[PDB]
Design a protein around this ligand. Structure first.
Ligand code: HEM
Ligand code: HEM
Ligand SMILES: N=C(NO)NCCC[C@H](N)C(=O)O
Ligand SMILES: N=C(NO)NCCC[C@H](N)C(=O)O
Ligand SMILES: [Zn+2]
Lengths: 414, 416
């Protein structure tokens, strides 16, 4: 049952004993493997048609409480048993319970640490947790969000942070940030079916306009936020421009690159994922750290279904776009990623290239093998979108599983 | 909706369901609990040398299934010819404990095995395979002749043609026909006194085996190894391939004139020879196959892997890049030029080769063909997506379902 994991570059071997702590199932079965699939239906965090079985919740709760007390080394102590009784007393009476701030802080860090698709987990211990559970309106959500952005951005010296809004309650709507990220560019479906801006945001762009936003017409227009308090229609809030740090893209040696007018925001703040700690679900808990250059240079700017600039750059580079064998695509992509690194560095905005990132992830895997006996990792997401085998992670076998606390996907609120 | 895996292509937004996996009678490494999909060698298809034949009944169910697949392919499922072959196979297994395939069944199964190979990106060519029947081979000496004939036909002076040579299957109470080498053409890996390796580090063990068996080793970086061929119940015999049969390509760069001075080269024919071909329960322990290279196999993995030739730093230094910092993307720049050199050199030498863009585009077409034909296609994402420029190819944005279908190409223990 315990997987023999091998590193093909070093020839070393380790055994993942941590996967035995996985209580939640993945999409894979012995008959077939579905690991390369992005979204699920089995792993998806379904709404509250009523309260989930007190036994199920009490079981996830006690385990989390056990995890917390081990973390502070006060396991078995009086404080530990009294807390377990508190949780049980609360679930038995109300069908749910609440976390203390220190437990929420520990839970958020473990969720990040347990994230299989995150290559920046060496930073898991350093996380600023903003308790926003004292929130009752969309307007209050906006203030907490603005403060998250101000803190996280820090004039370019990015700091990892997460803001946790009120947990889900049975028989009541969720607190939700409709946007997939706190900062995203609009995608305007221009008549011909084409798109001006980010194609990945066409839907959220349409909703913002549908809710009163007067749209622009640029390729890089920062979107307003649609914040939703329980059982209320989402409200529109335009983020203050001084809060949104952006980096104009230019190349270190190619003068004309800047002419392309490309740019990207500094803060990657995913805001559509659910944070589950001890059975409790936080439907609104935006998190952020800092970008790895390939996210912008390769995926956001070069994906065919995104900005898709590979050809424009190749033409400017005077490459042979007539045939695939000239590797015009590979060359253009390398310069674009280089332009991203040069630009962010020039602007004094935190960023990490894929080589540095994967090297530190390998160190993280080692730290974790000693600390927990394994590390859940999704190979397809950990290995960068360009130069895969040129990085150490490509040659490392990985085991993917779900541990809790965890960040999970959830249905779109509309 | 449907009761089958939902597969999405994120670039196009399209959806398909894999119904083919429902016919997968063999389990893989994964379980609901955890995914072991990134592991290269998961003890699943692994065929640890079974002392005696498969249980007459287990071999029978496998045999009946293959015969059923065969008749379905020729559209005579349920016919008299179909029912008679099933009886003949049972009678044969009943009196001898095993059975034999007709020529057309072997050709069908060999093609199916390739079609079923999850880690092969060149499967759009699956229907075009020359199957050399070598089931009459009785000696290592004859294995060599067949192998040389395979290399001559497959190489075809640069205009490569896919082929496979099938030697006698595993027999009850008789040793196996085995080719000790991982490939028909492989470069030697010499273990230096200072711990380093001259040549290909991947081949250190087979190189040392060739020496233990009488081979007089050279001392270059690109020395073609001799073959260690083994016939039933006999020690392996050493055979040197005639240099004129082994086509090689000297590597040069289209614009960087100094690249040629590096003295780098690669052989034209990728012929895996250590894999087991399983058809209807019958095991063909010696059945080398070959097609043509996809450029990244050479330019990225073989030449740039840290545990292979590891030439990244050397080429980067020649390009005058900053190898002291990761942010210069020196590894990326060098890798691109090395792959470009491989493509340019092969095209210059009139030798078949397919770049990673062309290969993945063609595999996307293959997936579409197979969706309509069988309702799915077993694919190992980690192996299908190229080692460089991954998301720049269409397959990166295509989810895939991986499972084991038979006939199949499986891994087998080293004969030593
Ligand atoms: C410290 C800097 C960080 C870096 C360099 C980093 C980098 C990455 C990268 C490259 C991905 C894949 C993104 C994609 O392909 O869309 C990712 C995913 C993820 N990261 Fe990190 N990360 C960092 C911080 C954080 C923090 C602070 C958290 C949580 C508290 C976090 C949670 C996750 C999660 C849950 C995912 C999965 C996203 C998804 O499923 O779409 N990351 N990270
Ligand atoms: C016609 C051109 C072909 C191309 C371009 C092609 C390309 C490839 C590539 C890129 C791989 C991955 C190799 C690696 O990462 O080590 C591969 C694997 C494979 N191919 Fe193909 N292939 C072709 C023909 C064939 C043929 C003719 C057969 C068999 C009859 C075949 C059977 C396989 C198998 C079983 C693997 C698995 C290798 C392993 O597990 O180590 N391929 N092929
Ligand atoms: N680096 C982070 N979080 O720290 N990335 C989160 C996903 C961001 C997404 N890949 C983007 O390009 O916008
Ligand atoms: N293209 C093929 N077969 O047609 N490849 C088989 C594996 C070859 C291996 N990747 C090599 O570089 O030698
Ligand atoms: Zn799996």
């Amino acid at each position: 049952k315990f997987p023999r994991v091998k590193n093909w570059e070093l020839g070393s071997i380790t055994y993942d004993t941590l996967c035995a702590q996985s209580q939640q199932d993945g999409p894979c079965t012995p008959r077939r493997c579905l690991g390369s699939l992005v979204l699920p239906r089995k792993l998806q965090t379904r709404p509250s048609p009523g309260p989930p079985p007190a036994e199920q919740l009490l079981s996830q709760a006690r385990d989390f409480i056990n995890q917390y007390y081990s973390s502070i080394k006060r396991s078995g102590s009086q404080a530990h048993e009294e807390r377990l009784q508190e949780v049980e007393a609360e679930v038995a009476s109300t069908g749910t319970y609440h976390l203390r701030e220190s437990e929420l802080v520990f839970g958020a860090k473990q969720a990040w640490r347990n994230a299989p698709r995150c290559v920046g987990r060496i930073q898991w211990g350093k996380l600023q947790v903003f308790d926003a559970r004292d929130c009752s309106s969309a307007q209050e959500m906006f203030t907490y969000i603005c403060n998250h952005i101000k803190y996280a951005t820090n004039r370019g010296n990015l700091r990892s942070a997460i803001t946790v809004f009120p947990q889900r309650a049975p028989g009541r709507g969720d607190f939700r940030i409709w946007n997939s990220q706190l900062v995203r560019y609009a995608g305007y479906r221009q008549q011909d079916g084409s798109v001006r801006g980010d194609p990945a945001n066409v839907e959220i762009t349409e909703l913002c306009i549908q809710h009163g936003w007067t749209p622009g017409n640029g390729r890089f227009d920062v979107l307003p936020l649609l914040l939703q308090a329980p059982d209320e229609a989402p409200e529109l809030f335009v983020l203050p421009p001084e809060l949104v740090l952006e980096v104009p893209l230019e190349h270190p040696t190619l003068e004309w690159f800047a002419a392309l007018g490309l740019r990207w925001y500094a803060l990657p703040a995913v805001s559509n994922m659910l944070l589950e700690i001890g059975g409790l679900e936080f439907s609104a808990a935006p998190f952020s750290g800092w970008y790895m250059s390939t996210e912008i240079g390769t995926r956001n700017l070069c994906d065919p279904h995104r900005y898709n600039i590979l050809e424009d750059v190749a033409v400017c580079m005077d490459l042979d776009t007539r045939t695939t064998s000239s590797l015009w695509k590979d060359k253009a992509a390398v310069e674009i990623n280089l332009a991203v690194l040069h630009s962010f560095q020039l602007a004094k905005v935190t960023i990490v290239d894929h080589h540095a990132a994967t090297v530190s992830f390998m160190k993280h895997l080692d730290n974790e093998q000693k600390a927990r006996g394994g590390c859940p990792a999704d190979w397809a997401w950990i290995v960068p979108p360009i130069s895969g085998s040129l990085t150490p992670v490509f040659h490392q076998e990985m085991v993917n599983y779900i541990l809790s606390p965890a960040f999970r996907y959830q249905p779109d609120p509309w």
